[PDB]
Design a protein around this ligand. Sequence first.
Ligand SMILES: Nc1ncnc2c1ncn2[C@@H]1O[C@H](COP(=O)(O)OP(=O)(O)O)[C@@H](O)[C@H]1O
Ligand SMILES: N[C@@H](CCC(=O)O)C(=O)O
Ligand SMILES: [Mg+2]
Ligand SMILES: [Mg+2]
Ligand SMILES: [Mg+2]
Length: 672
Amino acid sequence: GLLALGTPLQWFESRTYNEHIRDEGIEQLLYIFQAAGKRDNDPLFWGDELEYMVVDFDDKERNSMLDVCHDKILTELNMEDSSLCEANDVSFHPEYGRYMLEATPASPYLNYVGSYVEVNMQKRRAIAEYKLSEYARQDSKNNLHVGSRSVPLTLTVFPRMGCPDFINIKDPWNHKNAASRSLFLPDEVINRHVRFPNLTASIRTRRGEKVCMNVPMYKDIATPETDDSIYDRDWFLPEDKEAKLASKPGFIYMDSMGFGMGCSCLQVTFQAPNINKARYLYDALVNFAPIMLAFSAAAPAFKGWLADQDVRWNVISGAVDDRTPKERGVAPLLPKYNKNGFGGIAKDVQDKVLEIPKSRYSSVDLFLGGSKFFNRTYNDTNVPINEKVLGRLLENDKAPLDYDLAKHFAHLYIRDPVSTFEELLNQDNKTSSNHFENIQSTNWQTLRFKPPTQQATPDKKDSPGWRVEFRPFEVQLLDFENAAYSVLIYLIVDSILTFSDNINAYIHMSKVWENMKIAHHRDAILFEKFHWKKSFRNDTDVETEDYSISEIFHNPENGIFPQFVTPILCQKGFVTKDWKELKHSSKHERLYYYLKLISDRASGELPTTAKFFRNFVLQHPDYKHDSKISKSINYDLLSTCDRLTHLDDSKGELTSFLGAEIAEYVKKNKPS
Ligand SMILES: Nc1ncnc2c1ncn2[C@@H]1O[C@H](COP(=O)(O)OP(=O)(O)O)[C@@H](O)[C@H]1O
Ligand SMILES: N[C@@H](CCC(=O)O)C(=O)O
Ligand SMILES: [Mg+2]
Ligand SMILES: [Mg+2]
Ligand SMILES: [Mg+2]
């Protein structure tokens, strides 16, 4: 489904309704609860979301660019080609990036669907490729993008983002980018749907300074002292003057939403039997998030540089961080512009501003509790709340909520709305959840607790129930990797729900936040250590020790395989003792190779995508020992990515990247 249009409101015009929107949205929340609160027995439907990047290989120029010109695809697949999609059980939606695709199954999977995940993901890829080859045919006849070859790649990061000649538009700086006002990203990186440039503007204005994301550079032998791509400019005030102050020696400087939301990830959503189970599942998936973030790492480079981290998360965290310097407890960089650190916050409300520690895109703040093992002391972190909102969720005549669950919403509501259409100002709170969806959906966290709609009353057995979204996974090049990780979380989720009586996953939130920073460090999967529970089978216990990813996956006591994966395969009867038995199974071979891919990366035998791209850059003939990714390095890299994506072992790169056994296996074995 394509996002439907309207009159967007710019920040100065919109900010006067922040409070109207919040009130009305809570009201809607209340109705959702009153109507759907008592759903029970919802089945385990679930599905993934994939995100893709259309890359234009200009082979003759030896240049890989982001393709910002075939974006009609997203409308085509949703109008005249919406039937191809449906026939095929796939669905396409727009994403921040004009070069980006997003796609899901058209219907959620029900329980264990085997290789069908991968099948469905491959159909998504084939359809994009199909339409692209169509455009290539039309273009040829219209004499357009000559020498050009567009391919969709599930990259987490585009390695040359905001670097010279990184988009397939001639002379993109010959006009101004009023939306980002970025030094590096022409606004053509933004998807045309009004919502996206709106968000981009609203945050910058609210903030009163460009977003700013500094990423530690890798320290090669000739690496410059500073990010020498910073330049001075006079299009925009204050923005063009901000760089000198905001940047830092030994740090990749990035200054635009697209650096973050122009990144891709894998997401999986799950429906629990009911709100109570959903709380329990959400809570228990909290510490999986930073672990899977480390495990899945696929983004070792930004803005032309090898970074000294392997994942996207902090970059996306900064890319939409609407916090004024007031909200961050820091000096404005340009005080005559950003008046008293309040940026765009209306005068009449500056007095009710709070120091807020985390970007509205950031790791979960609070366990929701409501289950045997939960105790409020686990929420041991700084989490500012909207007390009016808490008040009203505690004391109202439609759905009085428990304190813990009230606090979660109360925390989401410390944010202002950042894109609102004029049409939409007054809703019927009994039927619309749009206003709440405004705040719900611009709190982008590692999980998301998804209420349903007011229309999802218990008698309606088919409407979406109470869901948990697992958001941290970096996205992988191959549909096999992404299916594998999708099934991993599926199994974990199933385990969790099947043994809900016996699994205590709680740990102090503060260790989770720490985990979330460890998870960024370069080669983290290979050696760093994380706070993980000592035992899950054990009421009244919340000890952690510090384990490696290898341990966290494989420890008999508290490992993901022996504690989560292996047990649920037993009660389903896929094996009797051990997951490895699958290698020999008739009905279930592919599952073996998923889990083995998973195992072998956790134990460091097989590399992460992040590792593999790093090695690749580091040993490229044109590599200059200075952390620089040149057009050429980028081109050959993305060329490998293309072949890898297609199981093309002609240069032994697949064997090199998945090892012999698995490479052979997938080369010789297509899904279901
Ligand atoms: N009943 C359901 N239970 C769980 N997950 C579902 C259900 N229906 C759809 N999904 C999945 O929810 C995800 C939401 O898709 P999307 O429209 O991209 O929303 P968002 O961007 O809010 O995650 C998809 O992966 C989809 O297949
Ligand atoms: N592309 C974002 C996900 C944002 C979204 O689509 O909800 C990420 O890497 O997390
Ligand atoms: Mg989506
Ligand atoms: Mg998405
Ligand atoms: Mg999602």
